[PDB]
Amino acid sequence: NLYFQSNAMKIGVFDSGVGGLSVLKSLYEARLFDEIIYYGDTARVPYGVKDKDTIIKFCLEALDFFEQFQIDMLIIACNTASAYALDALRAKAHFPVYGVIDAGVEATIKALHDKNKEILVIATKATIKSEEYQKRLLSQGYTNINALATGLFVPMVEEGIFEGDFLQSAMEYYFKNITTPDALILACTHFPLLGRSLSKYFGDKTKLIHSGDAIVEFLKERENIDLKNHKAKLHFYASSDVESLKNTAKIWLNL
Ligand SMILES: N[C@H](CCC(=O)O)C(=O)O
Numbered sequence: 001n002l003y004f005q006s007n008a009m010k011i012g013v014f015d016s017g018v019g020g021l022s023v024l025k026s027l028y029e030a031r032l033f034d035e036i037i038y039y040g041d042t043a044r045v046p047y048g049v050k051d052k053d054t055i056i057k058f059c060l061e062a063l064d065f066f067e068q069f070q071i072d073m074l075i076i077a078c079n080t081a082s083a084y085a086l087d088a089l090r091a092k093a094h095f096p097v098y099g100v101i102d103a104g105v106e107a108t109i110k111a112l113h114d115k116n117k118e119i120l121v122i123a124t125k126a127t128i129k130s131e132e133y134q135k136r137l138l139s140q141g142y143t144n145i146n147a148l149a150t151g152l153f154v155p156m157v158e159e160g161i162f163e164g165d166f167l168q169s170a171m172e173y174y175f176k177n178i179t180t181p182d183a184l185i186l187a188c189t190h191f192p193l194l195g196r197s198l199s200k201y202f203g204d205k206t207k208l209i210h211s212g213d214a215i216v217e218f219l220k221e222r223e224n225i226d227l228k229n230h231k232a233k234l235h236f237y238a239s240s241d242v243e244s245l246k247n248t249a250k251i252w253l254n255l
């Protein structure tokens with residue numbers, strides 16, 4: 001006879017490239033889903049230095065890619081995509097689509113629970129320029145905020161630079177004459193890879209807000225998700241050299 005997917009929770013995760021694995025890791029370890037389809041646009045990455053129209057266009061193409069999979073919802077792991085493409089994605093999609101920005105703001109408010117505390121948001125140029133984090137935080141009365149583009153962190157992470165003198169110099173470059181924040185929002189998929197180094201740089205007064213952990217808490221509240229028995233079945237796709245993506249995933253997720 002014939003069986004089709006019954007009660008199985010299958011979702012898509014989209015990112016501009018490999019960075020989004022940091023979000024995949026959180027979703028995977030949280031045991032929320034039975035199956036996850038990851039797609040990274042590695043042929044065209046990065047998005048963070050490009051313009052709104054291009055970013056939106058690329059995301060809508062990604063939505064097209066996913067429509068062959070019958071997913072229950074789509075997570076936009078990419079902070080840059082989350083900053084620009086959500087309206088357009090939702091207008092087209094007939095399943096829920098969630099980005100990581102709202103979640104990250106919510107996580108920051110839970111961590112600080114004091115609108116007077118200092119927040120530093122670090123992200124790509126496009127994300128900062130969107131003013132999405134700034135507007136959300138301001139609308140909640142959190143006005144003690146700095147928003148800084150720390151663009152070089154993206155290719156440094158891709159080159160495997162997670163500590164050392166060169167990374168210290170990049171941190172000094174971006175953070176010179178910056179006040180030490182009470183919370184640092186890692187508003188870019190690549191930035192958790194630098195978390196240990198960022199925390200050492202700023203010291204123990206600074207709480208790091210991880211976008212992947214944030215979206216996990218957000219999803220548990222917004223959707224009806226029972227914890228699953230096993231880890232999800234993972235499928236990886238990429239617009240270029242998918243084997244490299246899988247390799248990085250095996251390392252980052254300890255598969
Ligand atoms: N995925 C992007 C970083 C890499 C890129 O610029 O595309 C983000 O989270 O902002």
Ligand SMILES: [Cl-]
Pocket residue numbers: 097098099100101102103
């Ligand atoms: Cl969202």
Ligand SMILES: [Cl-]
Pocket residue numbers: 102105136137139140
């Ligand atoms: Cl908000």
